[PDB]
Design a protein around this ligand. Sequence first.
Ligand code: FES
Ligand SMILES: [K+]
Ligand SMILES: [K+]
Ligand SMILES: [K+]
Ligand SMILES: [Mg+2]
Ligand SMILES: [Mg+2]
Ligand SMILES: [Mg+2]
Ligand SMILES: [Mg+2]
Ligand SMILES: [Mg+2]
Ligand SMILES: [Mg+2]
Ligand SMILES: [Mg+2]
Ligand SMILES: [Mg+2]
Ligand SMILES: [Mg+2]
Ligand SMILES: [Mg+2]
Ligand SMILES: [Mg+2]
Ligand SMILES: [Mg+2]
Ligand SMILES: [Mg+2]
Ligand SMILES: [Mg+2]
Ligand SMILES: [Mg+2]
Ligand SMILES: [Mg+2]
Ligand SMILES: [Mg+2]
Ligand SMILES: [Mg+2]
Ligand SMILES: [Zn+2]
Lengths: 18, 101, 38, 222, 43, 122, 38
Amino acid sequence: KKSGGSSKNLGGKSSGRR
Amino acid sequence: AAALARLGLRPVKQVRVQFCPFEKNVESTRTFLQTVSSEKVRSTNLNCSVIADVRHDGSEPCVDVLFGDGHRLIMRGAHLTALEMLTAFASHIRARDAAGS
Amino acid sequence: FKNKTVLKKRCKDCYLVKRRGRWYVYCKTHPRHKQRQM
Amino acid sequence: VKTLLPVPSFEDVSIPEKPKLRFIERAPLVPKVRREPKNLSDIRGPSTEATEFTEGNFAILALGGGYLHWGHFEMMRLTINRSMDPKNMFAIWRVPAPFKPITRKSVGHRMGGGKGAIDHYVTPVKAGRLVVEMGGRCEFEEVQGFLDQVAHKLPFAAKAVSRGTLEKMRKDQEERERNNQNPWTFERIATANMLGIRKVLSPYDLTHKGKYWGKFYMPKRV
Amino acid sequence: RGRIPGRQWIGKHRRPRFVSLRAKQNMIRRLEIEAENHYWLSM
Amino acid sequence: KFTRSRIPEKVFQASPEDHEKYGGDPQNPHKLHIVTRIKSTRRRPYWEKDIIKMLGLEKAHTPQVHKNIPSVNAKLKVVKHLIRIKPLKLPQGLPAEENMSNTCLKSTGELVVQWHLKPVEQ
Amino acid sequence: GSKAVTRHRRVMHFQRQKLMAVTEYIPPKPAIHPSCLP
RNA sequence: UGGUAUAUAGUUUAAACAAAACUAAUGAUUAACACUCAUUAAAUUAUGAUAAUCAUAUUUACCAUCCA
RNA sequence: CCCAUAGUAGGCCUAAAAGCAGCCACCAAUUAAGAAAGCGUUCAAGCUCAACACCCACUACCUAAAAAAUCCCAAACAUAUAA
RNA sequence: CUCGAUGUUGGAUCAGGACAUCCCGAUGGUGCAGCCGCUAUUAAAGGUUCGUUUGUUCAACGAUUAAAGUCCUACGUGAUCU
Ligand code: FES
Ligand SMILES: [K+]
Ligand SMILES: [K+]
Ligand SMILES: [K+]
Ligand SMILES: [Mg+2]
Ligand SMILES: [Mg+2]
Ligand SMILES: [Mg+2]
Ligand SMILES: [Mg+2]
Ligand SMILES: [Mg+2]
Ligand SMILES: [Mg+2]
Ligand SMILES: [Mg+2]
Ligand SMILES: [Mg+2]
Ligand SMILES: [Mg+2]
Ligand SMILES: [Mg+2]
Ligand SMILES: [Mg+2]
Ligand SMILES: [Mg+2]
Ligand SMILES: [Mg+2]
Ligand SMILES: [Mg+2]
Ligand SMILES: [Mg+2]
Ligand SMILES: [Mg+2]
Ligand SMILES: [Mg+2]
Ligand SMILES: [Mg+2]
Ligand SMILES: [Zn+2]
């Protein structure tokens, strides 16, 4: 079992403004 | 030429081609003369003499071959193709070659 | 004989012949040119 | 009396200063940092760019979609340059250098953990695109041999063509469509939603018209 | 021998299905009906 | 994505050859359709299930009469692949109050106003 | 599932398979073979 | 077997358009030497492409290696 | 299939370059044969091809495979009117 | 799929099968003189060793052999064993 990396992109979870 | 030359004219003592050129049935015999008279075929055996007789008597063309063993082959070209005559000629060469030796 | 999916004549003495349901290349001058259809 | 015919003349033809194919880099000089989505549509359907002859008279015609990595470019360059006559022949690239980044994950890794790092670059190609174009004081029969050798080694269906054979190809396809005796065509059935067939067809099939399936081009489809 | 991987009619490798003559005739028969539906909806 | 299908208007423009094949008159368009469902709505999008209900075609092989007008034709075009459309023919004219109970719709599309169930003496 | 563009030729939905079979090019066949006429 | 590094005068060692070190020879110096100093001689694993940078196989180093 | 003589080993470079390592020209003899398209020779020789002659080759110019593990796997069938 | 259990390496015992053939058979090619080899076609009836160290599968080594084949069988086989 290899040790994996992590994603470097945070945020970007805003909902639609309608 | 090349096909006949490969076999050679070692056991052929003399080849005589007699045809009437003005006749309309001598094309096959004349083609036979062209093949046997080639430099390659003649060079195989220099002791064999190719004799071409041109006659205007109106007789049908004939090819007379004399082998060293003494046997003769007479091919009448009035109703024979050049290929057929050459094929028969080659076969007799092979037969007379083994007999002498 | 070498198995070949594409048969190619390698000299002027090579000839193609179909025997026993498959194509062959035969050569008397250079026997190494012999090929069998795979 | 064997009848001779006039030989074609190439006196007006002119050979560029650099006849051979130039070197194509593995990756762009400035490396791309932003990783891109897969975007497989870039090799799907008919090509709209580089479909016509420009300078030369001979070329390799793409008959399918695919990606050209640097290994392919080296095969094309070394084969054509080695085989061509520089004095009488010239060749130009009709495809850009590899520019689309392809990512790869570390060997043995599990699913997840973000996108993989950029590994190499490729050039997307669509069916109908000219990949390499040749010209000069020569006939198609002279270059057809080694051009076909290169076409066979490409990762997609390809064939060496000329200005004449390419035009004949298109004319034959147009004639087949005009003289087709089948009253039913994929175009008619798809665009009218006959039998509700669009429930099993892609929106792209309205324009592809059954001639393209994935990256594969079907030349016998009308 | 002659196994199909996984389930027959799904996935990457599937059992090949072939179009019989009567399957073609069935589809063409319905194409003719719809072709006529187009006509009677034109006036 | 699978969506509703827009049918080009050219599909519904009959050519002179079509008039010969099917025998309609462009200058005397038929007034009423005979519409019959011949194909299931199972495995069809929900919007096609709904229009079949609106046209009263829930039961298959049951002729229903509808007006040959743009609005009705617009619905029929959405489900053209599920139905058979034929023109209603009135060889003896419209039924009257006297013969309301003696009508029969034949398979040819002709609505006859007399149904004697007797052979033709001719 | 498989993506729209694949390395192998993807299997078609049977309805689509039937569509293709029914819309194949049919060439114009002459009544009398042209080779059998002057 | 698998990858990761590897190579420069005769040797030794930075760096590639070739720098220094030692050994070699020559001078300067000494009564003669050694030392020192100066000078000369002396090299880029070899193969294919970019045009002097990536590949190519070697070369020796370097760690990797049923399984429960 | 058939057939092949010649200015001449064109000049240049090269120890040698003679159609055939390279560079330049690529003209001319014979009714006909490229200052040579493919092999070959250390260089030459030598074997073909394009020529003439002979004469209906009266060419297709679309491509082309296969291997696994208990035991192949319905039986069969080219012929009586599309239902 | 199975955790209201489908016991987990190597070995012993007994092996069934594939052939992509290690040996034995039959052929083509060879830069095949011969003796030995190399490569390919066909062939799965029969055969395919004993030891030192290591739990080992492997590996190394000693002595042999016409040859000491590659794989699958719940990495065959613990209601047969270890
Ligand atoms: S069958 Fe008529 S020309 Fe041959
Ligand atoms: K290819
Ligand atoms: K499957
Ligand atoms: K369990
Ligand atoms: Mg967002
Ligand atoms: Mg959200
Ligand atoms: Mg299954
Ligand atoms: Mg999808
Ligand atoms: Mg002094
Ligand atoms: Mg000359
Ligand atoms: Mg000279
Ligand atoms: Mg010369
Ligand atoms: Mg010569
Ligand atoms: Mg030479
Ligand atoms: Mg010739
Ligand atoms: Mg239980
Ligand atoms: Mg056994
Ligand atoms: Mg075998
Ligand atoms: Mg055995
Ligand atoms: Mg086990
Ligand atoms: Mg027990
Ligand atoms: Mg057990
Ligand atoms: Zn040969």
